[PDB]
Amino acid sequence: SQSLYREIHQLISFKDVLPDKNLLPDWSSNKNPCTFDGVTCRDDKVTSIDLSSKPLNVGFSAVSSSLLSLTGLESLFLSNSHINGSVSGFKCSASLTSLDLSRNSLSGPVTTLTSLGSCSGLKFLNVSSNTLDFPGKVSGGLKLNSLEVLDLSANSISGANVVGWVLSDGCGELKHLAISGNKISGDVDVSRCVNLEFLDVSSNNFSTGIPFLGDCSALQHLDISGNKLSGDFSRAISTCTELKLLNISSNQFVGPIPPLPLKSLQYLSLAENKFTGEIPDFLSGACDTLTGLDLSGNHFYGAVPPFFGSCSLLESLALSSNNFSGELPMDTLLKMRGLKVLDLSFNEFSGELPESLTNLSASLLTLDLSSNNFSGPILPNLCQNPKNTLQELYLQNNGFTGKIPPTLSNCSELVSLHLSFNYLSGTIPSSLGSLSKLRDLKLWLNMLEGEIPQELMYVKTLETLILDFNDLTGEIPSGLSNCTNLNWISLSNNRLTGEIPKWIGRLENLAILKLSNNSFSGNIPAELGDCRSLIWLDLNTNLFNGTIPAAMFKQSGKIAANFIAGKRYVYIKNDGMKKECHGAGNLLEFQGIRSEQLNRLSTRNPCNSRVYGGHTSPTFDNNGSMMFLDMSYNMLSGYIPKEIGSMPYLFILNLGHNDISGSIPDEVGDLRGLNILDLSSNKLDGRIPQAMSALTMLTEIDLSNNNLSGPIPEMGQFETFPPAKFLNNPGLCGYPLPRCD
Ligand SMILES: *[C@@H]1O[C@H](CO)[C@@H](O[C@@H]2O[C@H](CO)[C@@H](O[C@@H]3O[C@H](CO)[C@@H](O)[C@H](O[C@H]4O[C@H](CO)[C@@H](O)[C@H](O)[C@@H]4O)[C@@H]3O)[C@H](O)[C@H]2NC(C)=O)[C@H](O)[C@H]1NC(C)=O
Ligand SMILES: *[C@@H]1O[C@H](CO)[C@@H](O[C@@H]2O[C@H](CO)[C@@H](O[C@@H]3O[C@H](CO)[C@@H](O)[C@H](O[C@H]4O[C@H](CO)[C@@H](O)[C@H](O)[C@@H]4O)[C@@H]3O)[C@H](O)[C@H]2NC(C)=O)[C@H](O)[C@H]1NC(C)=O
Ligand SMILES: *[C@@H]1O[C@H](CO)[C@@H](O[C@@H]2O[C@H](CO)[C@@H](O[C@@H]3O[C@H](CO)[C@@H](O)[C@H](O[C@H]4O[C@H](CO)[C@@H](O)[C@H](O)[C@@H]4O)[C@@H]3O)[C@H](O)[C@H]2NC(C)=O)[C@H](O)[C@H]1NC(C)=O
Ligand SMILES: CC(C)[C@H](C)[C@@H](O)[C@H](O)[C@@H](C)[C@H]1CC[C@H]2[C@@H]3COC(=O)[C@H]4C[C@H](O)[C@H](O)C[C@]4(C)[C@H]3CC[C@]12C
Ligand SMILES: *[C@@H]1O[C@H](CO)[C@@H](O)[C@H](O)[C@H]1NC(C)=O
Ligand SMILES: *[C@@H]1O[C@H](CO)[C@@H](O)[C@H](O)[C@H]1NC(C)=O
Ligand SMILES: *[C@@H]1O[C@H](CO)[C@@H](O)[C@H](O)[C@H]1NC(C)=O
């Protein structure tokens, strides 16, 4: 036929306008398209093309002129294909049924989509994750009332009543509307959409009316979360008898949990609102269908109603960040046959752990009991039940006394263990080396003694070791050389000894090494310079000596950090007020702990009030450098190597209280991101290099107690700092000091 001749010529003309033609290397003229990678054929005719996740790097016009006009094409999938430009009028084949253009760079007003009406058979349209917008006045209509599925999520659509604009010309055919991740406001009226099954209007700018749903005859999925809605949603969804998922989380709802349609309900989320009072007895009505419940981050209180035993289908129960109290209602949890995730974190549950809990170790994937008021010992008999499935165990920030049960090694599926912030004595059981899947061992702020288990080598998956604030002794176990995935090692405020092993250079994933306030010694390993993920080095308050190896900076400009991101931390800034408190500040892991309990450190730390929190976020993804370097309060000597200046992402530099001599390298002036510079109490001499006048981001400097001399630089930021920062430098003069003689 002709369409065959035309099919091949159209496909090859498309290939030919690609900047990287090597992308469709098996496409070629005088070959049958049905043999082409990306092509679906039925009876020797093209019915579908899928060029998704290939960087085609061409514009929509190339697509609509070559591809969308092919006779018989039924579906075109071009998600994440680097298509830019915008939709305009074109001839479209009547067979085309699905168009997926999601995750591209389509730009322009959302009114451009209206020109896709050329496609008389189009029923499914995904244009999510682009940059389509709605400039100014919202008038007219989208005019695609034949659609069954429309996805406009994650665009740049800012406007009021955009939904009415979408639905203006009719929605009798519409089954699934998603438009989340925009900035849409106003009214949502889908009452004329009597076949609508799926509505996601989440993460927008709604702060007035609740969506109006009319008879709600077909609605199964309703997501209005992530807005600023308040008011009577109970009445709005009261006609909704087929509802399976109701997500109203992250809004401004207040009062008690009101009546709900439970007979079909599988997923319910009320999280992150201002609901008050206690879980009502009437929710037992969903115990026949309910698979997921989330009431986290409200003001709920009291106990977990006993009715939950009937919710035998309930897989996840999340109630964290309320004020639930009482003992672990094991009598109810043991009936929830299907329970997999249990999250009661950040409440005020109390008492010891009931012995019956050891049964759930054979069904649960996650047990999150962090930040409560539990007391007593960790159940030794825990994970007796053969085939222990438990993956995550979070018991941090409670009142647990006793030893760490070696029995925990039987929970062989364990990926995450967090026993921090308790009162645990005894040693770190050697048997934890048996947890072949463990990624996180977090035991910080307890009273753990003895040495760090050599047997920890037997854990190949290990990524984080957080042992700060204990009573550990002995040296860094040579065995740890084996855990090559470590990206965060924190051993501060113990009584460790020995040197820093030279095998640290081995771990190419280590991003944070914190060894402060112990008794480590010897020289700084030039081997640290071999770590290619290292961004935070805190060796303060120890007994290291020798000279700062220039080699430790060899990685600067090559540093990659990706795995360390997204982890909750607190950074506690040192105010130079108390002389017993050392270092720039303490970076501490802080997943599942209340800041209100930082006061617990008072007895272990001479530091008093300045707490930064967040989630780790490197300032680059690649080609970075160290961001933090503290070696204060040691016995280092010799001169600062000029390579010190080679780290453009360095925010903090503390080398204070050592025996460093010679003169401040002029390369410090290259450290353009520097916020803090402490070189106090050393033996540095010569002149403050004028180059340092180029630093623009210094919020703090200290050069006091050296043998520096000559004039303080008048340009840059020096005039900004008080005299104290320069005291005890005999030959030093110039404002803020007395003028030079
Ligand atoms: C409009 O297009 C968007 C963008 O593609 C689309 O959203 C994305 O959908 C996909 C699935 O269709 C999501 O990817 C999933 O992510 C989950 C984790 O959250 C994974 O578990 C899933 O993996 C499963 O399936 C894979 C094969 O697809 C298997 O390899 C794997 O083993 C699992 O079985 C899956 O990868 C994606 O997260 C969303 N979100 C994005 C990218 O924004 C959206 O659904 C489209 N809209 C409509 C109406 O179709
Ligand atoms: C019930 O609803 C809640 C609340 O909406 C929901 O949890 C949320 O999931 C969404 C994903 O749909 C999360 O949103 C993302 O947050 C991450 C992390 O900060 C961001 O990186 C993401 O930004 C991207 O996507 C945006 C579009 O949504 C884009 O505009 C942006 O440019 C980025 O590409 C995104 O915002 C959100 O973090 C959570 N919220 C909370 C509080 O957990 C939950 O999953 C729902 N439950 C069920 C089962 O449906
Ligand atoms: C490096 O490690 C060591 C080991 O922790 C650390 O020494 C400890 O410092 C803390 C905090 O200063 C000390 O805690 C004190 O304990 C005594 C009793 O032994 C108490 O009397 C003290 O109480 C005072 O402060 C309280 C509030 O914090 C007040 O309520 C009270 O009225 C008192 O004023 C205080 O809690 C602890 O004794 C030492 N332990 C050791 C081993 O010496 C050291 O400070 C760390 N170094 C650095 C640089 O951080
Ligand atoms: C990359 C991570 C490991 C890291 C924790 C990161 O996520 C985090 O944002 C870091 C970069 C933060 C945590 C503490 C922050 C510092 C807080 O303490 C310092 O006093 C302030 C003072 C002042 O505000 C300066 O502008 C920056 C400055 C000095 C901050 C520099 C950036 C931080 C160091
Ligand atoms: C589309 O992307 C290409 C590649 O960068 C560019 O040359 C062209 O100008 C872009 N078109 C639009 C509309 O931005
Ligand atoms: C959300 O809507 C309000 C009211 O229309 C508007 O004033 C505001 O600009 C919008 N906020 C955002 C974050 O765009
Ligand atoms: C939370 O519950 C506890 C224990 O019953 C109660 O004493 C406390 O007042 C509650 N917290 C608040 C602030 O309501």
Indicate which ligand has the atom closest to the C-alpha of 540.
Answer: 3
Of all ligands present, the nearest one to the C-alpha of 272 is 2
Among the atoms of ligand 1, which is closest to the Cα of residue 153?
Answer: 1
Cβ partners under 8 Å of residue 206, min gap 6? 184, 185, 186, 188, 224, 227, 228, 229
Q: Is the CB of 348 under 6 A from ligand 7?
A: yes
**In angstroms, what is the span from residue 126 Cα to ligand 4's centroid?**
40
For residues 214 and 241, give the distance between their C-alpha atoms in angstroms, rounded to a whole number. 12
Annotated resolution, angstroms: 2.5
CA distances from 61 to 14, 88, 206, 604 (A): 10, 8, 35, 67
Token code pair at residue 59? 């514009």
Whether 131 and 105 have beta carbons less than 8 Å apart is answered as yes
- Quote the CA–CA distance of 162 and 109 in Å, as a whole number: 12
709 and 731 in contact (C-beta within 8 Å)? Answer: yes
**H/E stretch holding 15:** helix 2-16
- 676 and 698 Cβ atoms separated by less than 8 Å: yes
Q: What values do phi and psi take at 249, rounded to 5?
A: -60, 160
Give the β-pairing of 292-294 and 267-269: parallel
> Residue 369 C-alpha to ligand 2 middle, in angstroms?
24
Q: Which residues of 272-289 are buried (b: 16+ CB within 10 A; e: fewer)?
A: bbebeebbeeebbbbbeb
Cis bond upstream, residue 736 (ω within 30): yes
* CA 407 to centroid of ligand 5, rounded, Å: 61
Half-sphere exposure of 469 (CA within 13 A, CB side): 23
Q: Is 682 annotated as a binding residue?
A: no
Ligand nearest to the CA of 349: 7
Mapped onto helix, strand or coil, the DSSP state of residue 153 is coil
84 Cβ inside 6 Å of ligand 5: yes
Task: Give the span between the Cα atoms of 183 and 436, in whole angstroms.
Answer: 46
What's the 3-state SS for 179-196? CCCCEEECCCECCCCCCC
Q: Does the beta carbon of 59 sit less than 6 angstroms from any atom of ligand 5?
A: yes
Q: How is residue 135 written in tokens?
A: 């400039």
In the reported structure, the alpha carbon of residue 274 is separated from the centroid of ligand 6 by a whole-number distance in angstroms of 22
Residue 675 annotated as part of some ligand binding site: yes
Alpha-carbon separation of residue 400 from 326, 380, 391, 472, 591 (angstroms)? 16, 13, 20, 19, 18
Find the 409 Cα to ligand 7 centroid distance in Å. Answer: 36
Please name the helix (run of DSSP H) or strand (run of DSSP E) that holds residue 40, with its range, or none: strand 39-42
Cα(350) to centroid of ligand 7, in Å? 12
CA–centroid distance, 347 to ligand 7, in Å, is 10
Which residues have any ligand 2 atom within 6 Å of their CB?
154, 180-181, 202-203, 225-226, 247, 249-250, 267, 269, 272
Residue 546 CA neighbour count, 13 Å, CB half = 11
**Ligand 3 pocket, residues with Cβ under 6 angstroms:** 493, 517, 541, 580-582, 602-606
Dist. CA 189 → ligand 6 center (Å) = 20
Ligand 7 pocket mutation pick from 301, 322, 327 by most atoms within 8 angstroms of CB: 301
Q: Which ligand sits nearest to residue 159's alpha carbon?
A: 6
* 612 assigned ligand-binding residue: yes
For residue 180, report the distance from its CA to the centre of ligand 2, in Å.
9
Give the residue whose CA is nearest to atom 43 of ligand 1.
129
Distance 323 CA to ligand 7 centre (A): 6
Nearest Cα to Cα of residue 395 among 592, 200, 177:
592
How far apart CA 469 and CA 482 sit, in angstroms, is: 24
The sign of the torsion formed by the CA atoms of 321, 322, 325, 328 equals negative
Q: Residue 70: count other Cβ atoms within 10 Å of its Cβ.
A: 23
Specify the DSSP element, H or E, that contains 166. Answer: helix 162-167
Helix (H) or strand (E) holding 234: helix 233-236
How far apart, in whole angstroms, are the C-alpha atoms of residue 427 and residue 440?
18
Q: Which residue lies with its CA nearest to atom 14 of ligand 6?
A: 183
Ligand 4 centroid – CA 616 distance (Å): 10
Phi/psi zone of residue 383: left (φ > 0), alpha (ψ -120 to 50 degrees), beta? left
Q: Which ligand is nearest to the CA of 315?
A: 2
CA 622 to chain centre: 18
* Ligand 2 atom nearest to CA at 182: 30
Domains of the chain: 1-562+621-741 (3.80.10.10), 563-620 (3.30.1490.310)
Number of the ligand closest to the Cα of 86: 5
Residue owning the nearest CA to atom 2 of ligand 5: 84
Q: Indicate whether residue 126 lines ligand 1 (CB < 6 A).
A: yes
What string of H, E and C letters represents the secondary structure of 210-233? CCECCCCCCCCEEECCCCCCCCCH
Instruction: For residues 484 and 457, give the distance between their C-alpha atoms in angstroms, rounded to a whole number.
Output: 10
Q: Which helix (H) or strand (E) holds 317?
A: strand 316-318
> For 609, what's the count of Cα atoms within 13 Å in the CB-facing half-sphere?
9
**Binding site membership of 102 for ligand 1 (Cβ less than 6 Å):** yes
394 is in an annotated binding site: no
Q: Are 111 and 133 in contact (CB under 8 A)?
A: no
Q: State how far the Cα of 387 lies from the Cα of 730, in Å rounded to an integer.
A: 72
Angstrom distance (rounded) from CA 222 to CA 180:
12
Ligand 2 closest atom vs CA 226: 5
For ligand 7, atom 10, the nearest C-alpha belongs to 323
Helices then strands, counting H and E runs in the chain, come out as: 6, 50
Residue 352's alpha-carbon distances to 336, 357, 609, in angstroms, are 21, 11, 33
Classify strands 58-59 and 366-368 as parallel, antiparallel or unpaired.
unpaired
DSSP 457-510: GG-SS--EEE--SS---SB--GGGGG-TT--EEE--SS--BSB--GGGGG-TT-
Instruction: Give the angle 675-466-562 at the CA atoms, nearest 5°.
Output: 55
Asked if residue 699 has its Cβ within 6 Å of ligand 4, the reply is yes
Alpha-carbon distance of 331 to 173, in angstroms, equals: 49
